[PDB]
């Protein structure tokens, strides 16, 4: 019948980062036509496959790279009996046995599958808790360009990145950032979870922002207030700077959900230099009243001065971190 639980504290990020997600197996993103002696049909569609299907094992053999199919295509022609490889749909394994045609120009065989092995993106680091070195970034799920389903994580990594310029566009929406991944390929964290609330990993060594590198308390949504707030993000080189914003509206979500705050960009400098929210600000953290309250997750389709944010506690849950202050052993 006693009292006294402690408060959880994270360090705001704001650094521009590159994100590389290595999918489990390889990811089928679509289907492809190959030349048949008589008629024209595609094996994968007939075999029993669809966009977003992950081909973890080819005839019982696990695949870890795009190059892994190169020995398989020649070998598949020779035996020519069936391709019985197993796919993974959601959490359900699916086994389809189908046979390879050929590509006329090269003179080699074809599989008729369009496939990709990874996803790549520029975003913003949201926070890291120091004792566990764990970090949360992006605030939203990473998806495939064509399938629009989530990349299932084998592993992944993050890197420093830079904003080299902002370019006006005569045709289309005007303001666009051009960003620079790290060709030194220094992996500062790994990625162990691609989630609706973001990508969560362990950092190699603590990072710095030179603006807000002191652990702050984290808020529940009932504590969010309409009105001024602040964000952290990079608009020149790799320097993280504060930007005045406003919580236009805030919902006290009673279960995990995506768009718990509506936001408005009111800082003049950002309003000039980007017009508001633009690409790479996907993990940029939102600080109100000395508390980290969330991350920038969306721009309005037709309003770059307004957007959405995700409440911090759904990110913290996904990251294994208890927000009530409890601590796990070892």
UniProtKB/Swiss-Prot annotation:
Keyword Hydrolase in annotation: yes
Reaction(s) this enzyme catalyzes, per UniProt: Self-cleaves 52-Val-|-Asn-53, 62-Ala-|-Phe-63 and 74-Val-|-Thr-75 at the N-terminus of SpoIVB
Peptidase S55 domain mapped to chain residues: 92-330
Molecular function terms from GO: serine-type peptidase activity
Residues the record marks as active site: 140 (charge relay system), 267 (charge relay system), 282 (charge relay system)
Top-level taxon in the UniProt lineage: Bacteria
Span of domain PDZ: 5-91
Location(s) in or outside the cell: Forespore intermembrane space
Activity control, per UniProt: The zymogen is inhibited from undergoing autoactivation by BofC. The protease is inactivated by proteolytic cleavage.
Residue span of region PDZ binding: 297-299
Enzyme class: hydrolase
UniProt entry keywords in alphabetical sequence: Hydrolase, Protease, Serine protease, Signal, Sporulation, Zymogen
Any one biological process term the GO annotation gives: proteolysis
EC number of the protein: 3.4.21.116
Function: Plays a central role in the sigma-K checkpoint which coordinates gene expression during the later stages of spore formation. The protease is activated by trans cleavage of the zymogen precursor producing SpoIVB-45 kDa. This undergoes further trimming by cis cleavage to form SpoIVB-43 kDa and SpoIVB-42 kDa. The protease then cleaves the C-terminus of the SpoIVFA metalloprotease activating the latter.
Subunit structure: The PDZ domain mediates interaction with another SpoIVB protein during transactivation. Also mediates interaction with BofA during cleavage of SpoIVFA.
Protein name: SpoIVB peptidase
Protein species of origin: Bacillus subtilis (strain 168)
């Amino acid at each position: 019948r006693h009292m006294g639980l402690p408060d959880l504290k994270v360090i705001p990020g704001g650094q521009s980062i590159g994100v590389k997600l290595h999918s489990v197996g390889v990811l089928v993103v679509g289907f492809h036509q190959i030349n048949t002696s008589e008629g024209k049909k595609s094996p994968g569609e007939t075999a029993g496959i669809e966009a977003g299907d992950i081909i973890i094992e080819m005839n019982g053999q696990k695949i870890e790279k795009m190059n892994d199919v190169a020995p398989f295509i020649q070998k598949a022609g020779k035996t020519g009996e069936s391709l019985d490889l197993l796919i993974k749909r959601d959490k359900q394994k699916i086994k389809t046995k189908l046979i390879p045609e050929k590509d006329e120009g090269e003179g080699k065989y074809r599989i008729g599958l369009y496939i990709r092995d990874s996803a790549a993106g520029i975003g913003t680091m949201t926070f890291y808790e120091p004792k566990t070195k764990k970090y949360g970034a992006l605030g939203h799920v990473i998806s495939d360009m064509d399938t629009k389903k989530p990349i299932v994580v084998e592993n992944g990594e993050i890197v420093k990145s830079t904003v080299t310029s902002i370019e006006k566009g005569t045709g289309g929406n005007p303001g666009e950032k051009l960003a620079r991944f790290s060709s030194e390929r220094k992996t500062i964290g790994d990625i162990n979870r691609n989630s609706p609330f973001g990508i969560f990993g362990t950092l190699h060594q603590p990072i710095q922002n030179n603006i807000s590198d002191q652990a702050l308390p984290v808020a529940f949504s009932t504590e969010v207030k309409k009105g001024p707030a602040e964000i952290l993000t990079v608009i020149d080189d790799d320097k993280v700077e504060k930007f005045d914003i406003e919580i236009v509206s805030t919902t006290p979500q009673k279960f995990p959900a995506t768009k718990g705050m509506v936001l408005k960009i009111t800082d003049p400098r950002l309003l000039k230099e980007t017009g508001g929210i633009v690409q790479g600000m996907a993990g940029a953290p939102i600080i109100q009243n000395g508390k980290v309250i969330g991350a920038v997750t969306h721009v309005f389709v037709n309003d770059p001065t307004s957007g959405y944010g995700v409440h911090i506690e759904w990110m913290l849950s996904e990251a294994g971190i208890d927000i009530y202050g409890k601590e796990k052993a070892s």
